[PDB]
Amino acid sequence: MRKIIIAGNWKMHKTQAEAQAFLQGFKPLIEDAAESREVVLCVPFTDLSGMSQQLHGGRVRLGAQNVHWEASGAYTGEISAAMLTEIGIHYVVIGHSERRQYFGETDETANLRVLAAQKAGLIPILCVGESKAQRDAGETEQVIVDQVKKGLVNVDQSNLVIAYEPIWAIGTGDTCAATEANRVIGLIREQLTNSQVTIQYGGSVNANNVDEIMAQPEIDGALVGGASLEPQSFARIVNFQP
Amino acid sequence: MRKIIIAGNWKMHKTQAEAQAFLQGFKPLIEDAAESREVVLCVPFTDLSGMSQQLHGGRVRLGAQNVHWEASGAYTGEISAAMLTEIGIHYVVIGHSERRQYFGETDETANLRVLAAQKAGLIPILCVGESKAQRDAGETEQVIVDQVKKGLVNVDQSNLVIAYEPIWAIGTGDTCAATEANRVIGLIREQLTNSQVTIQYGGSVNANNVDEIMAQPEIDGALVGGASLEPQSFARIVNFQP
Ligand code: NA
Ligand code: NA
């Protein structure tokens, strides 16, 4: 059985004080979620250490939202794997569409970041997804296959999460049809050498479509943006039925 | 007199443990430094909170190495001004050439980040600098004029530091001649409405050229990369002599 992973991508939200208030409201709500479900909060760099303290010994895992591909060096503004493992966090989001759109991320640098994360013992969540223009031009399959191939060069597929996030579904409320997400995620799984990789859907997941999305046989989890920002919403997604 | 500011840009170096060890060796060496000299360490996001607790009541100020231009939002991996001011830090490096080279920074986004830092009460250090290609083409002056103009739209020039870092001098050991840094920095100062702005030189500053660089009439400080990584080196740069 593949691992179920419900991950919240806070993006650029929440001071440490706001993160603490979230956790005050969130921890009681997921106490009885099935123990086998992995719950991850992927939070700003400046929230990691404080939240690490508040979560130690509990079930909730922390993720960073980026990591650089070198161990150290002349990359002003970047955070290294060693900085993250010192805090003891478990996950890192890599290759998110917003870093490809705005901040120069390529398939090649995404791959290198994944490798750096793995060698440090972090669990990478590699994000892939086609644009509206690519989808409209009929290019989804080719784009996704190429992002997966380039993203996974030399990557250990026993320590890997993939999130399919069609770019047009991110933050728009235009959730991808669950059967179409299943279709593309099935195509991703076909490219893999380890078919047991957890593959998530992301893109306007909310408490009212999580059940339907998780009901798809190829889909093993969700990377949740806006609906992960408040406790009750994210808890209902963690507590998806059945 | 303009404010003298000696800033260390650690770039992607130092875990919290390594940052703590640096401060142990560094604090004794600048205890008696001239009180008029502002000493700044610009450190990775994950070191800011821990170092801040070790620095209360001291003279050493902290800077971050980036900040985003929006207060919050869908910018996975980015840190907002509110996240930094919560920690209480004083400075932020903006528009460093490494962000422009690798991570999609433009003059326009550097400007917007400067505005965000200022509105939060952070002191921005805006980095400008020409490439080797632009330098060899005789385009330094036009390039710098353009970066300063675009970088400073709507910017409060009473809360502003500029670092001139010719790109070919960064991390190479090819330090720009002091009188040439002085010449270009004079041209920068001519473009400002507030002539009292602190303008730093950056690019292979070390303990053996800091005296000559600081003696130039237009140069008010230094943004120091590799030579800020260990305490004895950086202290001698803080303790520059006539
Ligand atoms: Na499923
Ligand atoms: Na001077």
Residue numbers in the entry:
A (entry chain A), B (entry chain B): 1 to 242
Which sentences from the paper describe this structure?
In most organisms, TPI is an obligated dimer that folds into a (β-α)8 barrel known as the TIM barrel.
In order to have a structural understanding for the insensibility of SyTPI to H2O2 and thiol-conjugating agents, we growth protein crystals of SyTPI in complex with 2-phosphoglycolate (2-PG) that diffracted at a resolution of 1.6 Å. The active site of SyTPI shows that the catalytic residues Lys 11, His96, and Glu165 are poised in close contact with the inhibitor 2-PG. A superimposition of the crystal structure of SyTPI with TPIs crystalized in the absence of ligand (AtcTPI and AtpdTPI) illustrates that SyTPI exhibits a closed loop 6 conformation. SyTPI harbors a deletion of 7 amino acids in the loop that connects α-helix 6 with β-strand 7. In AtcTPI and AtpdTPI this region folds as a short α-helix, whereas this region in SyTPI folds as a loop that connects α-helix 6 and β-strand 7. SyTPI contains three cysteines per monomer. The thiol group of residue SyTPI-C127 is completely buried, whereas the thiol group of SyTPI-C176 contains the only accessible thiol group in this protein. A ribbon representation centered at residue SyTPI-C176, shows that this amino acid directly interacts with residues Y201 and S203 from the conserved loop 6 (phosphate-binding loop). An electrostatic map near residue SyTPI-C176 shows that this residue is surrounded by amino acids that have a negative electrostatic potential (D174, E212, E180) limiting the potential of this residue to react with GSSG or with H2O2.
